[PDB]
Curated annotation (Swiss-Prot):
It is linked to Axenfeld-Rieger syndrome 1: An autosomal dominant disorder of morphogenesis that results in abnormal development of the anterior segment of the eye, and results in blindness from glaucoma in approximately 50% of affected individuals. Additional features include aniridia, maxillary hypoplasia, hypodontia, anal stenosis, redundant periumbilical skin. Anterior segment dysgenesis 4: A form of anterior segment dysgenesis, a group of defects affecting anterior structures of the eye including cornea, iris, lens, trabecular meshwork, and Schlemm canal. Anterior segment dysgeneses result from abnormal migration or differentiation of the neural crest derived mesenchymal cells that give rise to components of the anterior chamber during eye development. Phosphorylated at Thr-8 by AKT2, but not AKT1. Phosphorylation impairs its association with a CCND1 mRNA-stabilizing complex, thus shortening the half-life of CCND1. Residues 3-62 bind DNA. It is found in: Nucleus; Cytoplasm. Belongs to the paired homeobox family. Bicoid subfamily. May play a role in myoblast differentiation. When unphosphorylated, associates with an ELAVL1-containing complex, which stabilizes cyclin mRNA and ensuring cell proliferation. Phosphorylation by AKT2 impairs this association, leading to CCND1 mRNA destabilization and progression towards differentiation. This is Pituitary homeobox 2. Interacts with EFEMP2. Interacts (when unphosphorylated on Thr-8) with ELAVL1/HUR. The modification Phosphothreonine is found at T8. The chain holds residues 85 to 144 of 317 of the full protein. It comes from Homo sapiens (Human). Residues 3-8 have a biased composition (Basic residues).
Length: 68
C-alpha cells in the first residue's frame, strides 16, 4: 500500500563500506557500482555522487576532509 519511492543519505556504516569499496577499486563499472549500491541499500546515482565526492576530496588542497 502507498508509494515505495524514498530518499537516503550516507550512514557511518555505508561510508565505511564505500571506503572499503574505494580501497578495492577507485572507479568500478556502472553494474559493479549498482551491485555495491544494492549491498549498501543506496541508489546507483547516490553511489555515483559518492565516487565524484571522494575523487574531489582526493584532488583538492583541503585538510581533514575524510575521517581517520
Amino acid at each position: 500500500g502507498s508509494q515505495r519511492r524514498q530518499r537516503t543519505h550516507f550512514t557511518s556504516q555505508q561510508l565505511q563500506e564505500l571506503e572499503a569499496t574505494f580501497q578495492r577499486n577507485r572507479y568500478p563499472d556502472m553494474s559493479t557500482r549498482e551491485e555495491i549500491a544494492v549491498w549498501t541499500n543506496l541508489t546507483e546515482a547516490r553511489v555515483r555522487v559518492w565516487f565524484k565526492n571522494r575523487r574531489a576530496k582526493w584532488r583538492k588542497r583541503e585538510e581533514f576532509i575524510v575521517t581517520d
